[PDB]
Amino acid sequence: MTKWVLHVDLDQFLASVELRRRPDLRGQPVIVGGSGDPSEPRKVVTCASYEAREFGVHAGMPLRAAARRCPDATFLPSDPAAYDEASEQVMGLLRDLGHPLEVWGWDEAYLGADLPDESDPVEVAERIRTVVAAETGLSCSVGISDNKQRAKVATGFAKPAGIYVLTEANWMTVMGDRPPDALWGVGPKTTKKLAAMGITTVADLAVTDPSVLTTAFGPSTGLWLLLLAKGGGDTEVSSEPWVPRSRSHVVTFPQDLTERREMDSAVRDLALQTLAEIVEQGRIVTRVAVTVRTSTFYTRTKIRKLPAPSTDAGQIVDTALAVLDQFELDRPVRLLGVRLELAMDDV
DNA sequence: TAGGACCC
DNA sequence: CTGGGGTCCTA
Ligand SMILES: Nc1ccn([C@H]2C[C@H](O)[C@@H](COP(=O)(O)NP(=O)(O)OP(=O)(O)O)O2)c(=O)n1
Ligand SMILES: [Mg+2]
Ligand SMILES: [Mg+2]
């Protein structure tokens, strides 16, 4: 037997959900992102359809920028409620296959399938794509491996509307020449730092001396980079439901704030909104964090612990406002955030 | 507790 | 010019 980890990922997820209720839009660049007004600054693309990516639009691109790259695009506001519902539908199908299923956010999931050696895991992936496409009309892609990060890499190669198997046998064949940020968990910064010490590919990283990595990145991350390069990863698929460690809301204002009372009032409001939401989820706050980002994109966060876990509005607002007040302010403010850390014990 | 990195 | 929302490890 083999413990396959299958990674299921919805294709161009938000655009697909839109397209599914808008046939007038097929074969057209559709871009999802922020009220649907491409002229608004400080708002980004959240999901570009494939047709739009052909113009170099991508998630995280400002709306103004996407409009410049793709002037004929149809821009639609983000409908979270339609997406939650489209996601739950896809999860229920995936969970109904009988395997352990570990759901991450709207779009993705790990399925664990312990299979006898004669059985092709590609058969389960084929079952998944069929059922998802037939019941929901969404297309997904499936990456197959024996750990999560490697399955996750496989899904990139399966894109779009396909299945790709990546194992110990072809791992290095396939990955060896690629830069390190091809690895899940390795982004641009690590790639840059690695290149500066002359490690420029997955193959290089995979044979780097452990001391070199642990000195440069830390005793755990250094060993982890080396495991990642060798094609290893997390391997247990848990069906246990995720319990959030925190909840948060941030706002980027249309115009930089300069008036203290305005800053006070946004932090109050975000503290209150987050608190109402956590209470509804039956949770209790332990710590309150405030984030301030200035016009220059300097972003600092302070945090204070409550004297006892609490849910009390007056206290949480008062704490968020005292934390705000520890920042040197006045200097124009681009963004304010409140994050509430939550009691892990009990609930 | 602060910060930086990554990912969706 | 550069969103919003999480989580993890390092100093
Ligand atoms: N920067 C990002 C990346 C993704 N997302 C949201 C919107 C996406 O449709 C959803 C899924 O992310 P994703 O799976 O990387 N990409 P998407 O499903 O849109 O297209 P594919 O490349 O998966 O086919 O997460 C986001 O809001 N911000
Ligand atoms: Mg996806
Ligand atoms: Mg995804």
CB within 8 Å of A15: residues ≥ 6 apart: A30, A31, A32, A47, A48, A49, A50, A52
- The answer to the question of whether A72 is labelled as a binding residue is no
- Across A258-332, the runs of DSSP E, i.e. the strands, are 285-294, 299-310
Query: Are A342 and A244 a contacting pair, CB within 8 Å?
Result: yes
Structure tokens at A345: 């014990």
Instruction: Report which ligand 1 atom has the smallest distance to the Cα of A159.
Output: 24
* Cβ of A39 less than 7 A from strand C: no
Query: Are A94 and A8 a contacting pair, CB within 8 Å?
Result: yes
Residues with CB under 7 A from strand B: A 9, 59-60, 104-105, 107-108, 152, 181, 183-191, 287, 289, 300-305, 326
Chain C footprint bases within 7 A of protein beta carbons = 1-11
How far apart CA A165 and CA A208 sit, in angstroms, is 26
Angle at A126 between CA A154 and CA A144, to 5 degrees: 25
Q: For A43 and B1, how far is CA from C1' in angstroms?
A: 31
- In this structure, which amino acid lies at residue A259? E
- Phi, psi of A103, rounded to the nearest 5 degrees: -95, 130
Residues pairing with A310 in the sheet: A285
CB within 8 Å of A301: residues ≥ 6 apart: A289, A290, A291, A292, A337, A339
3-state secondary structure of A108: strand
Is ligand 1 within 6 A of the CB of residue A59?
A: yes
Q: Which helix (H) or strand (E) holds A93?
A: helix A80-95
Residue that the structure tokens 């007004």 belong to = A37
How far apart CA A66 and CA A73 sit, in angstroms, is 8
CB within 8 Å of A121: residues ≥ 6 apart: A2, A4, A6, A113, A115, A144, A165
Give the resolution in Å. Answer: 2.3
Is ligand 1 within 6 A of the CB of residue A60?
A: yes
- Phi, psi of A33, rounded to the nearest 5 degrees: 180, -30
Q: How many H-runs (helices) and E-runs (strands) does chain A carry?
A: 13, 12
Closest CA to A248 of A269, A271, A282, A266: A271
Query: Are A222 and A216 a contacting pair, CB within 8 Å?
Result: yes
How far apart CA A199 and CA A136 sit, in angstroms, is 44
Ligand (nearest to CA of A43): 1
Query: Are A338 and A322 a contacting pair, CB within 8 Å?
Result: no
Query: Are A267 and A336 a contacting pair, CB within 8 Å?
Result: yes
Query: Are A154 and A122 a contacting pair, CB within 8 Å?
Result: no
Q: Of all nucleotides in the shown strands, which has a C1' nearest the CA of A40? A: C3
How far apart CA A300 and CA A92 sit, in angstroms, is 40
Is ligand 1 within 6 A of the CB of residue A10?
A: yes
What is the DSSP annotation of A263-278?
A: HHHHHHHHHHHHHHHH
How far apart CA A131 and CA A137 sit, in angstroms, is 9
- The answer to the question of whether A312 is labelled as a binding residue is no
CB within 8 Å of A8: residues ≥ 6 apart: A94, A108, A109, A110, A111, A128, A132, A140, A141, A142, A155
Residues pairing with A316 in the sheet: none
Task: Residue A339: give the domain boundaries.
Answer: 252-347
Catalytic pick among A18, A51, A102, A108: A108
Structure tokens at A235: 């391997």
Experimental method: X-ray
Q: Is the dihedral of CA A131, A136, A137, A141 positive or negative?
A: negative
How far apart CA A248 and CA A315 sit, in angstroms, is 17
How far apart CA A248 and CA A133 sit, in angstroms, is 34
* Cβ of A335 less than 7 A from strand C: yes
Can A262 be counted among the known catalytic residues?
A: no
How far apart CA A342 and CA A281 sit, in angstroms, is 11
Report the side by side order of strands in the sheet with A108-115. A101-104, A108-115, A2-10, A140-145, A163-165
**What CATH number has the domain bearing residue A317?**
3.30.1490.100
Distances (CA, A) of A10 to A17, A145, A239, A240: 10, 18, 19, 22
Q: Of all nucleotides in the shown strands, which has a C1' nearest the CA of A45? A: C3
**What CATH number has the domain bearing residue A39?**
3.40.1170.60
Distance A47 CA to ligand 1 centre (A): 6
- The answer to the question of whether A270 is labelled as a binding residue is no
CB within 8 Å of A49: residues ≥ 6 apart: A12, A15, A19, A28, A29, A30, A31
3-state secondary structure of A262: helix
- The answer to the question of whether A114 is labelled as a binding residue is no
What is the length of chain A?
347
